[PDB]
Amino acid sequence: AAAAAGAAAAAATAWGAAAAACALNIAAAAAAKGAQIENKAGAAAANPYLVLAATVAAGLDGIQSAGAAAGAAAADAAAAAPSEIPGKMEDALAALEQDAECLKAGLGEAFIRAAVAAAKYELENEETDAEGNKFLEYFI
Amino acid sequence: AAAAAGAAAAAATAWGAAAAACALNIAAAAAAKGAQIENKAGAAAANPYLVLAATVAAGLDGIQSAGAAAGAAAADAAAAAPSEIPGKMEDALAALEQDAECLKAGLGEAFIRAAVAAAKYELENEETDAEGNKFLEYFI
Amino acid sequence: SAEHVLTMLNEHAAAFVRFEATDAAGASRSKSIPAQFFEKVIHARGYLEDGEVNAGAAGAAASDIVLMPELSTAAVAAAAAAATAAVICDGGAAAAASPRYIARAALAQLQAAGAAAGLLSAFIADFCIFGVPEVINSKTISFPASTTAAAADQPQEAAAGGAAGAAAGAAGGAAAAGAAEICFLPEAAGAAAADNAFTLRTGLQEVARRYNAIASAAAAAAAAAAGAGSHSIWDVGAAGTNAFAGASGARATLTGAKWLAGLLAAAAAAAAAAAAAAAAAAAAAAGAAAAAATAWGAAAAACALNIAAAAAAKGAQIENKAGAAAANPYLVLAATVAAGLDGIQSAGAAAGAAAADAAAAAPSEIPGKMEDALAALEQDAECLKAGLGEAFIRAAVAAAKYELENEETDAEGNKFLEYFI
């Protein structure tokens, strides 16, 4: 809802130093030590440790694909890049299975599936008994 | 609840002509044409056509097993016969699968399973999708 | 030391002293007097009282029973509004309904059998906390209700300065502090949940009340969430060393496997103390983290009798889960030991360790009828309800039964006439 359309929104996945709505500003400075970037694609409902992980995981493989950010935004408040983009969940899943390297980089998840399996066994034991009763209630 | 314990209950599965609580009285009469029996093992919440069927289905095979009603009740309000009896659902199911001939005699049921299958296919399609979601919610 | 209890009255300027005990259901109880009454006689004769105040402790022709305070267990009652002390007691005349004296018989039997010289257990029991509980029943309605500042239901509600926006979630509030606190930390108490359970059970409530809240031990205090379990760890020793350490599975040993065999066999009857209320049966119901699976292992987390594996052999122990905080501590401490004390004499075995899916292997036991549960109670029968009577119970209960049967036989006499008309 905070990322929805408006004159000061930040959903425009673009970079620049004057187009204030673009998600990835350059923090220009007089001292070279202060030349940095400025990210806007989020809100305080987030998880700090997982944002700090995920934003770095993207940068850590952009330097290995040797990809490019296209030209800087200096026109009207949204477009150039935006783009990305294909307009379907099937293509979002295709991206997740082709790159896939700027995304969810390293580790598992072995601890998650081990703990979640114990909960799933109890849930599936209750659900399979309920489904067993429901099937009889459909055959009558 | 109507068949529960009390001084005028009718759950005593027995026969006679003076023990008023016994479920199967003899309707004694001066004219031989009026010699009949008197059944008490039910209440007006029943289905008339299915009671009329089931009570006859019992009599229709008692004449083929050549079984006997034991001695008439003339003692205190309950016992002799009661009996039957074994005190478990497993033995009630064993009786349903050994006699089985005084019970649910003839027909099917082909019409019931044909109509109920159409309802069961819709119910199982909704339930298997719900179980599919529940299994994922147990694996996390 | 009688001398130490007497000098504590001067050292802490105690104006009064509190005698303390526990009932058969599992709740602590207390009474008090001025400190000036303490003399050499009570150290050998206790305090005589009329037992007719309790419907299972005396009778009208025997209206004299004894509370017996002890002289190694005194403490300052620091939660009180005045300078006072507290002392736990046994009960006697007699007697054999005092849970602490019943628990001491299991410790005496452990030593008298020559199997070991002591028992080295501890507990990790959970609890609940609230601000406004409301629970009532009548001829026309029945409902429980409760709430707390951490509850997942509060962030949608208004408050006198707005909501904090910081509540927990369903099975998602594992952020509380410890050791919860002043009934274990300043005493460095360490020892088993026999005597130590009741300072914790009163302390949790008293500290919550002094912070405008309340605390409880209800095993299933809310649906679709965690509850007040009473999980523990268990061990045996003599001559200064552990007796469950060895070279079988998860660093256990053969006498440990025989204690486990006793515990597995007794689980269907140990539940009468460890799960003493319907809330504990609800906590033991089916789910992904239930503990009703009467089995042993070191990885199958749902199994009731884990092995507490450790790098030091002195720390090789077992971990029991078959109960909740609605239990009676002294009778759990007695019953769980009574099972182990005869598993070593039947020389039974715990079968193979559980490492498969969350329930089965052993479970088993098992026959599926009350008649077979009663048959087990009359064939073994030796891991269960071991030693004592009960002579004190039947003597006090007979006095109550004579009054009840005199009222009931007159009522039945009237009812028979009302059936003959």
Short mmCIF file of C-alpha atoms in Angstrom, two decimals, chain C:
data_model
loop_
_atom_site.label_atom_id
_atom_site.label_comp_id
_atom_site.label_asym_id
_atom_site.label_seq_id
_atom_site.Cartn_x
_atom_site.Cartn_y
_atom_site.Cartn_z
CA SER C 1 20.22 -27.64 63.46
CA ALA C 2 17.54 -26.43 65.93
CA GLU C 3 20.07 -23.73 66.99
CA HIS C 4 20.26 -22.31 63.41
CA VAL C 5 16.43 -21.98 63.13
CA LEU C 6 16.34 -20.25 66.57
CA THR C 7 19.20 -17.79 65.67
CA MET C 8 17.51 -16.93 62.30
CA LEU C 9 14.59 -15.43 64.35
CA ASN C 10 17.11 -12.94 65.90
CA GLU C 11 19.29 -12.50 62.71
CA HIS C 12 16.20 -11.41 60.64
CA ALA C 13 14.11 -10.00 63.59
CA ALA C 14 11.18 -12.36 62.69
CA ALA C 15 7.88 -11.38 64.42
CA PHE C 16 5.99 -14.45 62.99
CA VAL C 17 6.74 -17.86 61.34
CA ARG C 18 4.79 -19.72 58.58
CA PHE C 19 4.30 -23.52 58.61
CA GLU C 20 3.87 -24.96 55.06
CA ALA C 21 2.58 -28.24 53.49
CA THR C 22 0.93 -29.63 50.26
CA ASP C 23 -2.36 -31.51 49.58
CA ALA C 24 -3.07 -34.71 47.53
CA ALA C 25 -4.30 -32.66 44.49
CA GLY C 26 -0.94 -30.74 44.27
CA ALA C 27 -1.49 -27.28 45.87
CA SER C 28 0.59 -25.81 48.74
CA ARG C 29 -1.12 -24.67 52.02
CA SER C 30 0.09 -22.70 55.09
CA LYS C 31 -0.58 -21.44 58.69
CA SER C 32 1.29 -19.02 61.04
CA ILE C 33 1.99 -17.93 64.67
CA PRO C 34 4.22 -15.37 66.55
CA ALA C 35 7.94 -16.34 66.70
CA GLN C 36 7.78 -16.25 70.59
CA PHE C 37 6.16 -19.78 70.67
CA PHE C 38 9.35 -21.53 69.33
CA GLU C 39 10.93 -23.77 72.06
CA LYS C 40 12.78 -27.17 72.46
CA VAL C 41 9.48 -29.20 72.70
CA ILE C 42 8.16 -28.46 69.14
CA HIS C 43 11.50 -29.76 67.69
CA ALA C 44 10.51 -33.26 69.03
CA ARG C 45 6.61 -33.14 69.17
CA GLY C 46 5.58 -30.69 66.36
CA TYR C 47 2.19 -28.87 66.57
CA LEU C 48 -1.05 -30.69 67.49
CA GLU C 49 -4.21 -29.56 65.58
CA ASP C 50 -7.85 -30.59 64.99
CA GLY C 51 -7.86 -32.52 61.67
CA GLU C 52 -11.72 -32.40 61.18
CA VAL C 53 -11.08 -29.10 59.24
CA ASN C 54 -9.93 -31.43 56.35
CA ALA C 55 -12.32 -34.19 55.06
CA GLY C 56 -9.45 -36.80 54.65
CA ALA C 57 -7.00 -36.21 57.58
CA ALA C 58 -8.90 -37.18 60.84
CA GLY C 59 -12.26 -38.26 62.40
CA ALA C 60 -14.48 -37.08 65.31
CA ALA C 61 -13.08 -39.64 67.86
CA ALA C 62 -9.45 -38.81 66.78
CA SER C 63 -9.52 -34.93 66.47
CA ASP C 64 -5.70 -34.64 67.13
CA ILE C 65 -3.00 -34.81 64.37
CA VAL C 66 0.56 -33.35 64.11
CA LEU C 67 2.28 -30.89 61.77
CA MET C 68 6.07 -31.55 62.00
CA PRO C 69 8.33 -28.59 60.94
CA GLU C 70 12.02 -29.22 60.05
CA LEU C 71 15.36 -27.69 61.04
CA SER C 72 17.39 -27.60 57.76
CA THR C 73 14.68 -25.96 55.52
CA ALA C 74 13.88 -22.54 57.14
CA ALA C 75 13.96 -19.31 55.03
CA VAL C 76 13.03 -15.57 55.29
CA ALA C 77 9.50 -14.95 53.88
CA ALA C 78 10.81 -11.83 52.02
CA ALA C 79 7.59 -11.30 49.92
CA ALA C 80 5.62 -10.47 53.17
CA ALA C 81 4.65 -6.96 54.45
CA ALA C 82 6.62 -7.63 57.74
CA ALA C 83 9.78 -9.35 59.12
CA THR C 84 8.76 -13.09 59.05
CA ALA C 85 10.08 -16.61 58.21
CA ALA C 86 8.76 -19.84 56.59
CA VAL C 87 9.33 -23.59 57.32
CA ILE C 88 8.05 -26.62 55.34
CA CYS C 89 6.60 -29.55 57.35
CA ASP C 90 5.81 -33.24 57.20
CA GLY C 91 2.42 -34.42 58.66
CA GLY C 92 1.86 -37.32 61.11
CA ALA C 93 0.12 -39.21 63.96
CA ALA C 94 0.39 -41.70 61.83
CA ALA C 95 0.45 -40.68 58.75
CA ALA C 96 0.25 -41.69 55.04
CA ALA C 97 -1.59 -38.92 53.07
CA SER C 98 1.18 -36.23 53.46
CA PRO C 99 2.73 -36.22 49.89
CA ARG C 100 6.27 -35.28 51.14
CA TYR C 101 6.34 -38.24 53.60
CA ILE C 102 5.06 -40.56 50.78
CA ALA C 103 7.91 -39.26 48.51
CA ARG C 104 10.50 -39.93 51.32
CA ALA C 105 9.47 -43.64 51.32
CA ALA C 106 10.71 -43.96 47.67
CA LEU C 107 14.11 -42.45 48.75
CA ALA C 108 14.26 -44.93 51.69
CA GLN C 109 13.41 -47.88 49.32
CA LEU C 110 16.16 -46.77 46.82
CA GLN C 111 18.76 -46.98 49.66
CA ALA C 112 17.29 -50.13 51.36
CA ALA C 113 17.33 -52.11 48.03
CA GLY C 114 21.12 -51.31 47.75
CA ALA C 115 20.61 -50.29 44.05
CA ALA C 116 22.11 -46.79 44.71
CA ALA C 117 22.40 -44.13 47.52
CA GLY C 118 20.60 -41.07 45.97
CA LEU C 119 18.72 -39.53 42.99
CA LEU C 120 20.00 -36.56 40.95
CA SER C 121 16.92 -35.23 39.02
CA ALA C 122 15.85 -31.65 38.05
CA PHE C 123 12.86 -29.91 36.29
CA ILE C 124 12.27 -27.32 33.49
CA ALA C 125 8.46 -26.83 33.89
CA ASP C 126 6.57 -24.07 31.99
CA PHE C 127 3.90 -21.61 33.27
CA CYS C 128 1.39 -18.97 32.00
CA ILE C 129 0.77 -15.25 32.85
CA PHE C 130 -2.33 -13.00 32.54
CA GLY C 131 -3.85 -9.58 33.46
CA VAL C 132 -7.68 -10.23 33.42
CA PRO C 133 -8.84 -13.91 33.57
CA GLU C 134 -12.65 -14.49 33.83
CA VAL C 135 -14.02 -18.07 34.32
CA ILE C 136 -17.61 -18.88 35.48
CA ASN C 137 -20.34 -21.58 35.19
CA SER C 138 -24.12 -21.72 36.01
CA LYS C 139 -27.44 -23.52 35.19
CA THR C 140 -27.62 -21.30 32.00
CA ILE C 141 -24.01 -20.56 30.75
CA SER C 142 -20.37 -21.82 30.95
CA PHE C 143 -17.22 -19.98 29.67
CA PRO C 144 -13.49 -19.33 30.29
CA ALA C 145 -11.70 -16.13 29.09
CA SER C 146 -8.26 -14.45 29.62
CA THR C 147 -5.84 -11.78 28.23
CA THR C 148 -2.26 -10.36 28.57
CA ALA C 149 -0.25 -7.44 27.03
CA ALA C 150 1.79 -9.93 24.90
CA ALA C 151 -1.31 -11.73 23.42
CA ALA C 152 -1.80 -11.92 19.60
CA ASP C 153 -5.46 -10.69 20.07
CA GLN C 154 -4.54 -7.25 21.61
CA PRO C 155 -2.86 -5.32 18.63
CA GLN C 156 -6.34 -4.74 17.00
CA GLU C 157 -7.71 -3.09 20.25
CA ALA C 158 -7.58 0.50 21.63
CA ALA C 159 -5.76 1.59 24.86
CA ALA C 160 -5.42 4.72 27.11
CA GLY C 161 -2.29 5.88 25.11
CA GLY C 162 -2.74 3.74 21.93
CA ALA C 163 -1.52 0.15 21.26
CA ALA C 164 2.21 -0.76 21.61
CA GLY C 165 2.24 -2.66 18.22
CA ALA C 166 4.66 -5.23 19.78
CA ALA C 167 2.54 -8.33 20.73
CA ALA C 168 3.69 -11.97 20.19
CA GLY C 169 2.15 -14.47 17.67
CA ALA C 170 0.49 -17.93 17.89
CA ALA C 171 3.32 -20.41 18.81
CA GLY C 172 5.60 -17.32 18.25
CA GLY C 173 6.51 -15.73 21.65
CA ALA C 174 9.78 -17.58 22.61
CA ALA C 175 11.47 -14.33 23.89
CA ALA C 176 10.81 -14.40 27.71
CA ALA C 177 13.59 -13.90 30.35
CA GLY C 178 14.92 -16.33 33.06
CA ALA C 179 15.43 -17.89 35.64
CA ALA C 180 12.01 -16.28 36.53
CA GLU C 181 13.80 -15.62 39.18
CA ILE C 182 14.02 -14.89 42.96
CA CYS C 183 12.81 -18.35 44.19
CA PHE C 184 15.93 -20.07 42.69
CA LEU C 185 18.72 -17.49 41.94
CA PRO C 186 19.47 -15.93 45.44
CA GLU C 187 19.21 -19.43 47.04
CA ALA C 188 21.35 -20.97 44.20
CA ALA C 189 18.88 -23.80 44.93
CA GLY C 190 19.93 -26.43 42.27
CA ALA C 191 18.21 -29.53 43.84
CA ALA C 192 15.19 -31.58 42.60
CA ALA C 193 11.53 -30.37 42.39
CA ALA C 194 10.42 -32.11 45.62
CA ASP C 195 10.78 -29.26 48.21
CA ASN C 196 11.82 -26.64 45.54
CA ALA C 197 8.57 -26.85 43.45
CA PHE C 198 6.37 -24.94 45.95
CA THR C 199 8.63 -21.86 46.46
CA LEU C 200 8.54 -21.58 42.60
CA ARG C 201 4.70 -22.14 42.38
CA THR C 202 3.97 -19.45 45.04
CA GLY C 203 6.85 -17.17 43.82
CA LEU C 204 5.57 -16.91 40.20
CA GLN C 205 2.13 -15.78 41.52
CA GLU C 206 3.48 -13.43 44.28
CA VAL C 207 5.96 -11.66 41.91
CA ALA C 208 3.24 -11.29 39.21
CA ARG C 209 0.78 -9.79 41.82
CA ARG C 210 3.54 -7.28 42.86
CA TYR C 211 3.65 -6.24 39.12
CA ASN C 212 -0.21 -5.88 38.77
CA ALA C 213 -0.56 -9.29 36.97
CA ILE C 214 -1.14 -13.03 37.80
CA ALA C 215 0.48 -16.41 36.95
CA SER C 216 -0.83 -20.02 36.56
CA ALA C 217 0.09 -23.67 35.82
CA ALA C 218 -2.91 -24.61 33.57
CA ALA C 219 -1.52 -27.25 31.13
CA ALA C 220 -3.71 -26.03 28.17
CA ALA C 221 -4.53 -22.40 29.23
CA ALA C 222 -5.37 -21.42 25.57
CA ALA C 223 -6.20 -23.26 22.28
CA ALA C 224 -4.01 -23.25 19.08
CA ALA C 225 -0.86 -22.44 21.19
CA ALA C 226 1.78 -23.86 23.62
CA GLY C 227 0.98 -24.79 27.29
CA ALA C 228 2.36 -25.37 30.83
CA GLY C 229 4.29 -28.71 30.44
CA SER C 230 6.38 -30.16 33.38
CA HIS C 231 9.32 -31.84 31.57
CA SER C 232 12.28 -33.04 33.70
CA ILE C 233 15.70 -34.79 33.72
CA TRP C 234 16.49 -37.91 35.78
CA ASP C 235 19.58 -39.66 37.18
CA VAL C 236 20.79 -42.07 39.93
CA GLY C 237 24.04 -42.25 41.98
CA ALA C 238 26.18 -43.69 44.80
CA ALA C 239 29.69 -43.07 46.34
CA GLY C 240 29.86 -39.64 44.52
CA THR C 241 29.24 -40.89 40.88
CA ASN C 242 26.52 -41.11 38.16
CA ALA C 243 24.91 -44.59 37.59
CA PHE C 244 23.14 -44.04 34.16
CA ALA C 245 26.44 -43.33 32.28
CA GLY C 246 27.86 -46.20 30.12
CA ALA C 247 28.47 -47.65 26.62
CA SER C 248 24.90 -48.37 25.28
CA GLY C 249 22.91 -45.96 22.98
CA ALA C 250 23.47 -42.17 23.51
CA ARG C 251 26.02 -42.99 26.35
CA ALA C 252 23.35 -44.65 28.57
CA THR C 253 23.82 -48.06 30.37
CA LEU C 254 21.95 -51.36 31.11
CA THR C 255 20.51 -50.24 34.53
CA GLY C 256 19.42 -47.00 32.74
CA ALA C 257 17.66 -49.18 30.09
CA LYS C 258 15.97 -51.13 33.00
CA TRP C 259 14.79 -47.81 34.60
CA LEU C 260 13.47 -46.81 31.12
CA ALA C 261 11.71 -50.23 30.78
CA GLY C 262 9.98 -49.56 34.16
CA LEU C 263 9.02 -45.98 33.10
CA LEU C 264 7.62 -47.20 29.70
CA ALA C 265 5.52 -49.92 31.44
CA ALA C 266 4.26 -47.51 34.18
CA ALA C 267 3.39 -44.53 31.84
CA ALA C 268 -0.37 -45.44 31.76
CA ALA C 269 -0.50 -45.07 35.63
CA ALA C 270 2.22 -42.40 36.29
CA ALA C 271 -0.16 -40.10 34.30
CA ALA C 272 -2.55 -40.20 37.36
CA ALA C 273 -0.02 -37.86 39.12
CA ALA C 274 1.84 -36.31 36.10
CA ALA C 275 -1.41 -35.36 34.20
CA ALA C 276 -3.81 -34.97 37.21
CA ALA C 277 -6.39 -32.72 35.32
CA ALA C 278 -8.36 -32.64 32.00
CA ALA C 279 -6.17 -29.69 30.82
CA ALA C 280 -3.12 -32.06 30.86
CA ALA C 281 -5.07 -34.63 28.76
CA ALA C 282 -5.84 -31.74 26.32
CA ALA C 283 -2.10 -30.75 26.30
CA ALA C 284 -1.25 -34.45 25.53
CA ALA C 285 -3.68 -34.51 22.49
CA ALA C 286 -2.47 -35.19 18.89
CA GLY C 287 -0.11 -32.63 17.23
CA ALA C 288 3.34 -32.09 15.61
CA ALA C 289 5.05 -31.44 19.04
CA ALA C 290 2.99 -33.69 21.43
CA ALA C 291 4.73 -35.85 24.12
CA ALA C 292 2.24 -38.77 24.65
CA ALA C 293 4.48 -41.16 22.56
CA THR C 294 5.74 -43.56 25.35
CA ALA C 295 9.15 -44.22 23.69
CA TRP C 296 12.90 -43.48 24.18
CA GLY C 297 15.67 -42.06 21.92
CA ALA C 298 18.06 -39.10 21.31
CA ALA C 299 16.68 -37.40 18.10
CA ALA C 300 12.89 -38.19 17.85
CA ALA C 301 11.87 -35.05 19.85
CA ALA C 302 8.20 -36.17 20.41
CA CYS C 303 9.29 -39.38 22.30
CA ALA C 304 8.46 -39.20 26.05
CA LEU C 305 11.86 -40.48 27.45
CA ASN C 306 14.83 -38.76 25.71
CA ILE C 307 18.49 -39.51 26.59
CA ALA C 308 20.28 -36.35 27.82
CA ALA C 309 23.54 -37.02 25.89
CA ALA C 310 26.64 -35.06 27.10
CA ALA C 311 30.43 -34.78 26.45
CA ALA C 312 31.17 -35.47 30.17
CA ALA C 313 30.11 -39.00 31.32
CA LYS C 314 28.87 -37.45 34.66
CA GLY C 315 26.18 -35.59 32.58
CA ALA C 316 24.77 -38.72 30.80
CA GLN C 317 21.12 -38.74 32.07
CA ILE C 318 17.47 -39.22 30.83
CA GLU C 319 14.71 -36.64 30.04
CA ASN C 320 11.02 -37.31 30.92
CA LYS C 321 8.10 -35.46 29.18
CA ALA C 322 4.89 -37.42 30.10
CA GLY C 323 3.29 -34.62 32.26
CA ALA C 324 2.14 -31.01 32.80
CA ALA C 325 2.28 -28.37 35.60
CA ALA C 326 -1.26 -29.22 36.89
CA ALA C 327 0.53 -32.25 38.55
CA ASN C 328 1.43 -32.89 42.25
CA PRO C 329 5.30 -32.55 42.49
CA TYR C 330 5.84 -34.89 45.51
CA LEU C 331 3.60 -37.66 44.03
CA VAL C 332 5.25 -37.35 40.54
CA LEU C 333 8.70 -37.56 42.25
CA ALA C 334 7.43 -40.71 44.09
CA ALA C 335 5.63 -42.46 41.14
CA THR C 336 8.38 -41.97 38.47
CA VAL C 337 10.94 -43.47 40.95
CA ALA C 338 8.58 -46.37 41.93
CA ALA C 339 8.54 -47.41 38.22
CA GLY C 340 12.39 -47.36 37.95
CA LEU C 341 12.84 -49.18 41.33
CA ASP C 342 11.14 -52.37 39.93
CA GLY C 343 12.28 -52.18 36.24
CA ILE C 344 15.73 -53.08 37.74
CA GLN C 345 14.12 -56.16 39.50
CA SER C 346 11.95 -57.48 36.60
CA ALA C 347 15.10 -56.95 34.44
CA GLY C 348 12.80 -55.75 31.57
CA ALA C 349 14.03 -53.93 28.42
CA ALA C 350 13.07 -50.61 26.73
CA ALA C 351 13.19 -52.12 23.15
CA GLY C 352 15.14 -50.30 20.34
CA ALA C 353 15.57 -46.48 20.32
CA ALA C 354 13.18 -44.28 18.26
CA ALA C 355 14.80 -42.59 15.19
CA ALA C 356 11.93 -42.89 12.60
CA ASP C 357 8.80 -40.64 12.18
CA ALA C 358 7.50 -38.77 15.29
CA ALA C 359 5.34 -41.59 16.85
CA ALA C 360 5.47 -45.48 16.99
CA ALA C 361 8.31 -47.95 17.97
CA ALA C 362 7.70 -48.64 20.85
CA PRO C 363 4.03 -47.43 21.10
CA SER C 364 2.64 -50.23 21.74
CA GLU C 365 2.49 -50.99 25.17
CA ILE C 366 -0.70 -51.69 24.56
CA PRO C 367 -4.19 -53.29 24.86
CA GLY C 368 -7.20 -51.07 23.98
CA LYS C 369 -9.64 -51.70 26.94
CA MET C 370 -10.23 -50.61 30.58
CA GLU C 371 -10.45 -54.34 31.54
CA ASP C 372 -6.85 -54.84 30.25
CA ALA C 373 -5.64 -51.62 32.00
CA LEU C 374 -7.09 -53.12 35.26
CA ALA C 375 -5.48 -56.53 34.40
CA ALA C 376 -2.07 -54.73 34.08
CA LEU C 377 -2.72 -52.96 37.47
CA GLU C 378 -3.21 -56.52 38.99
CA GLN C 379 -0.22 -58.30 37.24
CA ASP C 380 2.40 -55.45 37.36
CA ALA C 381 1.33 -54.08 40.01
CA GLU C 382 5.08 -53.78 41.04
CA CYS C 383 6.32 -50.83 38.89
CA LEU C 384 2.99 -49.26 40.11
CA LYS C 385 1.89 -47.92 43.57
CA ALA C 386 4.89 -49.65 45.25
CA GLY C 387 4.79 -50.09 49.09
CA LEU C 388 2.94 -48.34 51.99
CA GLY C 389 -0.67 -47.91 52.90
CA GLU C 390 -3.29 -45.96 53.09
CA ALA C 391 -4.35 -47.07 56.63
CA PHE C 392 -4.43 -43.32 57.56
CA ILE C 393 -6.49 -42.51 54.39
CA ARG C 394 -9.13 -45.25 55.04
CA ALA C 395 -9.34 -44.30 58.78
CA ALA C 396 -10.04 -40.58 58.02
CA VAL C 397 -12.24 -41.33 54.93
CA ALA C 398 -14.32 -43.89 56.95
CA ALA C 399 -15.37 -41.09 59.40
CA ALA C 400 -16.59 -38.96 56.42
CA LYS C 401 -18.23 -42.05 54.73
CA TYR C 402 -20.23 -42.89 57.92
CA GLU C 403 -21.82 -39.37 57.91
CA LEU C 404 -22.41 -39.48 54.09
CA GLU C 405 -23.94 -43.03 54.22
CA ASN C 406 -26.21 -42.01 57.18
CA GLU C 407 -27.61 -39.10 55.06
CA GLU C 408 -27.78 -41.24 51.85
CA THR C 409 -29.51 -44.29 53.51
CA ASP C 410 -32.25 -41.98 54.93
CA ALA C 411 -32.66 -40.37 51.45
CA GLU C 412 -32.80 -43.87 49.80
CA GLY C 413 -35.38 -44.92 52.48
CA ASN C 414 -37.63 -41.99 51.41
CA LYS C 415 -36.96 -42.68 47.65
CA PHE C 416 -38.01 -46.38 48.01
CA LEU C 417 -41.38 -45.29 49.56
CA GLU C 418 -41.76 -42.75 46.67
CA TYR C 419 -41.25 -45.71 44.21
CA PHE C 420 -43.73 -48.11 45.98
CA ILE C 421 -46.69 -45.58 45.86
#
